[PDB]
Amino acid sequence: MANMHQLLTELVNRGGSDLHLTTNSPPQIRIDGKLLPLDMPPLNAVDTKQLCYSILTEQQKHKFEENNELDLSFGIKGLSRFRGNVFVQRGAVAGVFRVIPYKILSFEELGLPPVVRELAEKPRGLVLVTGPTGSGKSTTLAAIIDKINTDRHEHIVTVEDPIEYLHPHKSCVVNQREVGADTKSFKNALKYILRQDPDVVLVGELRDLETIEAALTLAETGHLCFATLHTNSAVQTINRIVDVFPSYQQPQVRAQLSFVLEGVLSQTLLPKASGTGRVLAIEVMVPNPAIRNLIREDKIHQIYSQMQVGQEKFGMMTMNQCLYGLLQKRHITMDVGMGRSPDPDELKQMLTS
């Protein structure tokens, strides 16, 4: 099965995020979100079965044959880490493999503004990095955590399902817990995380009420907490967070957020104007006293207006302001910027200004 080795090598070499193997199609690779077939014959059921089975242990093979489903992770030394999923479709084996890179890119390499660098220096509070799946959230978080590891002498604990970016010890002590192996669940890790003397905590996705309450507790007890959401803007993120709670407990949730919130980042990856790379578009909200009052008063919407005027002082930036800058530097096309702008008339006005 030296074909799996060559297929995964091409996946790495061409900068693909995911490799897809299924019957009646050639192997296909996702690059910056878009699928490309490899110049190979289409696979049959024999091909897909032999190829997917070639990277499994006997226990994992029997587990797949017992369930027609299998999640796993594996490494190719000197090449990359991978997340694998094996399943069955149309009576035949299919497989998907996701890249977990060895190298974390820097802030400047990722296109992140200096305000993110100042956020990596925050001593305590809740910082949220949000966006849709595969919008660069884990990569940005890994860059911030790598900066903390480099600059501070503190204890960083991450809880991940699964562990993606690895952070070997630099000046910090870094402990990384994988759900389903190192710890039973997010709930159990968060149940014991406060007794483990942390300073900085990564909690992963805000998957349930319990994890949300844990993040509010972390931000209230003197820690810097990182979490993700799949929301697309700062205002949408705050409303989503508040509205998951029963109406009687939303006052407390709003007060907690008004006290502890230190930053909201909402990312999305857009195709570059060149047609091959992708560029990060990011909305940055850094709370000032006015925004904290709007949070306490339940006037969430008006926060967007504060972001429109917080450019010079705090490095704040609405999504439309970022799309404007990406458009003037010719990094994205006009169609992509307009097609994704949350308010096209504002972007038009900025383009006329």
Q: Which of 3, 6, 54, 89 binds its own copies (CB under 8 A)?
A: 89
What are the structure tokens assigned to 115, written together?
């305000």
> Between 11 and 156, whose beta carbon lies closer to ligand ANP?
11
Question: Is 137 a residue that touches ligand ADP (CB under 6 A)?
Answer: yes
Ranges within 256-285 binding ligand ADP (CB under 6 A)? 269, 278, 280
Taking alpha carbons only, the member of 99, 108, 100 closest to residue 147 is: 108
> Between 64 and 165, whose beta carbon lies closer to ligand ADP?
165
Q: Which of 50, 73, 138, 333 binds ligand ANP (CB under 6 A)?
A: 138
Residue 78 marked ligand-binding: no
Alpha carbons 202 and 262: distance in angstroms, whole number: 15
Amino acid found at 257:
L
Ranges within 99-128 binding ligand ADP (CB under 6 A)? 110-111
Segment near its own copies (CB under 8 A); pick from 102-110, 176-184, 313-321, 322-330? 176-184
Look at residue 177 and give the partner it binds from Mg ion, ligand ADP, its own copies, none, a contact being a CB closer than 5 to 8 Å depending on partner kind.
Answer: its own copies
> Please, are residues 101 and 164 in contact by the beta-carbon 8 Å criterion?
no
341: which residues sit within 8 A by CB, 6+ positions away?
319, 320, 323, 347
Tally of CB atoms within 10 A around 114: 10
Q: Which of 5, 14, 184, 348 binds its own copies (CB under 8 A)?
A: 184
Binding mask 233-272 for its own copies (x = CB under 8 A): ---x--xx--xx-xxxx-xx--x---x-------------
247: which residues sit within 8 A by CB, 6+ positions away?
none
Binding mask 231-270 for ligand ANP (x = CB under 6 A): --------------------------------------x-
> Please, are residues 319 and 341 in contact by the beta-carbon 8 Å criterion?
yes
Phi, psi dihedral angles at 263 (to 5 degrees):
180, 140
Site for its own copies (CB under 8 A): how many residues?
79
Minimum gap (Å) between residue 74 Cβ and ligand ADP: 15
Minimum gap (Å) between residue 269 Cβ and ligand ADP: 6
Look at residue 136 and give the partner it binds from Mg ion, its own copies, ligand ADP, none, a contact being a CB closer than 5 to 8 Å depending on partner kind.
Answer: ligand ADP
Question: Is 138 a residue that touches Mg ion (CB under 5 A)?
Answer: yes
Cα distances from 36 to residues 17, 28, 147, 274, in angstroms, run: 11, 5, 35, 17
Taking alpha carbons only, the member of 309, 257, 317, 326 closest to residue 115 is: 317
> Between 252 and 328, whose beta carbon lies closer to its own copies?
252
> Between 80 and 108, whose beta carbon lies closer to its own copies?
80
Question: Is 134 a residue that touches its own copies (CB under 8 A)?
Answer: yes
What is the per-residue burial (b if ≥16 Cβ within 10 Å, else e) of 150-186? eebebebbbbbbbbbbebeebebebbbbbbeeebebb
Q: Which of 111, 113, 198, 310 binds ligand ANP (CB under 6 A)?
A: 111
Burial category of 292 from C-beta neighbours within 10 Å (exposed 0-12, middle 13-18, buried 19 and up): middle
Question: Is 288 a residue that touches its own copies (CB under 8 A)?
Answer: no
Q: Which of 13, 59, 133, 247 binds ligand ANP (CB under 6 A)?
A: 133
What are the structure tokens assigned to 202, written together?
């990564």
Question: Is 84 a residue that touches ligand ADP (CB under 6 A)?
Answer: no
3-state secondary structure 223-271: CEEEEEECCCCHHHHHHHHHHCCCCCCHHHHHHHHHHHEEEEEEEEEEE
111: which residues sit within 8 A by CB, 6+ positions away?
279, 280
Alpha carbons 350 and 353: distance in angstroms, whole number: 5
Look at residue 175 and give the partner it binds from Mg ion, its own copies, ligand ANP, none, a contact being a CB closer than 5 to 8 Å depending on partner kind.
Answer: its own copies
Question: Is 353 a residue that touches ligand ADP (CB under 6 A)?
Answer: no
Q: Which residues are annotated as a binding site?
A: 83, 98, 110, 134-139, 164, 195
